[PDB]
Structure formats: C-alpha cells, structure tokens
Design a protein around this ligand. Sequence first.
Ligand SMILES: CSC[C@H]1O[C@@H](n2cnc3c(N)ncnc32)[C@H](O)[C@@H]1O
Ligand SMILES: [Zn+2]
Ligand SMILES: [Zn+2]
Lengths: 297, 116
Amino acid sequence: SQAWQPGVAMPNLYKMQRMLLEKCDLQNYGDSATLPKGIMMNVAKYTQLCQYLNTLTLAVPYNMRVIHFGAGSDKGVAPGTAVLRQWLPTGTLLVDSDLNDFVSDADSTLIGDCATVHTANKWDLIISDMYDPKTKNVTKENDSKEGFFTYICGFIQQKLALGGSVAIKITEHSWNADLYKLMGHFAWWTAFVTNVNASSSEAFLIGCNYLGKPREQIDGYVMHANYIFWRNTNPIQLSSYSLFDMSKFPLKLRGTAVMSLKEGQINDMILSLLSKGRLIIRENNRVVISSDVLVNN
Amino acid sequence: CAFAVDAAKAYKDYLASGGQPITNCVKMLCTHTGTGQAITVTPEANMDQESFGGASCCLYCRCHIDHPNPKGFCDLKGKYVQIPTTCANDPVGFTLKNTVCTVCGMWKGYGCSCDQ
Ligand SMILES: CSC[C@H]1O[C@@H](n2cnc3c(N)ncnc32)[C@H](O)[C@@H]1O
Ligand SMILES: [Zn+2]
Ligand SMILES: [Zn+2]
C-alpha cells in the first residue's frame, strides 16, 4: 500500500535502535520509476516531498518566509523552487540559493557558497537539496561530513523561527551527526524517502515544529546507522502514482499566529502550541538578505 | 548609439533555420483542469495545455540578457505559463511569438474567444 503514498517515512521503531553503521546496499538499486511524460526527476521529487509535508503539522503563517538552498540544476534552472512556489500559499516570500548561477522563480536568488548567505530575518521553512557528489567514495570510511552541513546547523539554530520546519537532503555518504542531533530540537522528526527516487539512499531529514531546545538527546552517528539499517532491510517499491493526483497539492493556508517572544517567556504552554503547529515565534519586519563577496585581484 | 542585440529575432531565425528549441523548461505536475489562462500565479493548464515554471520559459532569463523594456521587468518569472500541448516542445519560442489578450487572459488564437 506504500506505492500510493508520496514516499515512505522512517518508522519510529527503527529510530529507537542502536545499529552499527553498515554499507547501504539497496535491493532496488538501479531500478527507476516511470515518470509522467516530460516530467523531470527533480520536479517529481519535490512534488512528493511537498505531498508528504502536507501530512505534517507545519506552521503556515501569513507572510510565510521560506528559504531554499541548493536550488540550481546543472541546466541553470530551479525545478525544486518552481514546485515550492506552486505549493506555498500565493504571496509567500521564497528565497533560493546555490553555488552556481541559475534562473529562478523565487522572489530573490543568491548565487555563491551557502556560507556566504546571511539574513536579517528568521524563516518559517528551510529546504535544502545541497549535495556534493565527491562524498560518494565507497572505498573510505563513512564519517560525518561537515562543509555545508555545518552552515545548515548554525543557520537552523540562529535563523529558524520557533515553530518552523526543515527538510534537509541527506544520502548514505552525505550526512552530518549534529544535524541528526538537531532533529531532537523539534517536536517531531523523520527521514523521508520519495517513492520516485526510492532506488537511491537519499532521504530528506525533516524537523517538524522547531522548539529551540533539546526535546530528546539523539546520537547522530547512531541515528544515521539506524537510517541505513532501515533502508537496507526495507525495500521501497519505486512509484510515480501520487504524481497523478494533484487536486489536494497546495499547502493549506492556516493563518498560523506569529508572536515576538523573548527566551524567558517560552513556557510549557507556548512549547505545546509550537509543538502542535499553531504558533510561530519571530519578528515580522522586512526580509533582508545578502551574500558576502570576497574581493581579490 | 542605436545598437541593441535582438535576441528575439535571433532565436526566431535560428528556429526557422531548423535549430533545436531551448530545452529544460520546467514542466509542472498539475490537474490539467485549470482555467487555461496564459500566465498565472499557480499552474492553470487545462486539458490541452502544459504548465511550466515561468522563468525557465523566458528567453531573456534563460539567455542571461536584459529584458526589452525600460525597467527590465520580466512578466514570466515567479509565475507559471500555460503552453498548448502541441507547442510544448518549444515553450520559449511560444511565449516569444504569441500575445496575451488583456481582457480574457488567454492566448490570442489559443483560447481567446473575445473576437467572436
Ligand atoms: C540540486 S543538486 C545539488 C546542489 O547542491 C549544490 N551545493 C552543493 N554544495 C553547496 C554549497 N556548499 N553551497 C551551495 N550550494 C551547494 C550544488 O551546486 C547542486 O546544485
Ligand atoms: Zn525573464
Ligand atoms: Zn480575449
């Protein structure tokens, strides 16, 4: 029955194990889903990610703020951004970014390494497809990777509104222990595998409703090993089925309340509202972004 | 000086010369039960149309050149463009050669029925 879902989320019991890290060996490796005629993998993938995010308690405020890292294709366009803009309520401010130049439907685009990106405002949703293919070295140990993951951890901690959510792409080799640990600072988390790309070890690590404090202690080395164990023992049948029913695609406009609060007034009552997807905590000022430019000869 | 690169004319002439259209326009998944209007804030393809991310179908966006108007504004990027399915092999050429009726929002000759 999974084949009619947009994808498969990591079952809670696998999250609770203490597996050792093993090589990822997917039974359905090299299989491919048959995409609708003329549909790109990256459109299908973001469509299924958004269909799954429709089932979670995302905070959706008026004047929602979404930032999308790793948004450029090798063709110079932004398919994922186009899906996010289709999905998000009209009027949502959408900023995207990538190392290489691309043309985009986002309200603003920053070109450069994500470590050069700074924003004054906080964000309601952070999406990342950043991925470095150099990490796919099956011949050396699979250790926690830093690079852009280090930036992403700090960007979540400093610039994600309480109540906000993230979806960060990982793979067998592209992962970071602190990011998994950060998942314990949300009311709920999972690793989500799209049905169209289920032959790959990629997943999106989704933190749902940020709490700004550790709700649970997660060892990220153990959790990634648990994630691989799940993938290794649970073949996911490749499927495009959910792409053919878009009648309920748009994210529900929930009118979620936005409040400015200071660390001393986040009580258990507020935390429970955050946990339920009913509250965003941040300022409501102008969205201002910038890219640092290194000047040399 | 009066010099200005004419990319629209160059692309049309390259098309007439038998050149392969610009590819990797971003086609969206949608119901195909939409209004069929030409340029919309969300995908609106009807049964005879495909919906594409606007920026990916704009010649000026895709070629990294200025948009031909004083303010250099682009009326495709950030929107979705409906392209007739029979013309969806060349969305950039289609948007370049066709015009939007300002009353009905449909393409002239591809959905506009105002002149009847
Ligand atoms: C959509 S495929 C993966 C994307 O992630 C981007 N990416 C990988 N590493 C970084 C980085 N450090 N900063 C910004 N983008 C990155 C790549 O340019 C690629 O387009
Ligand atoms: Zn343009
Ligand atoms: Zn008309």
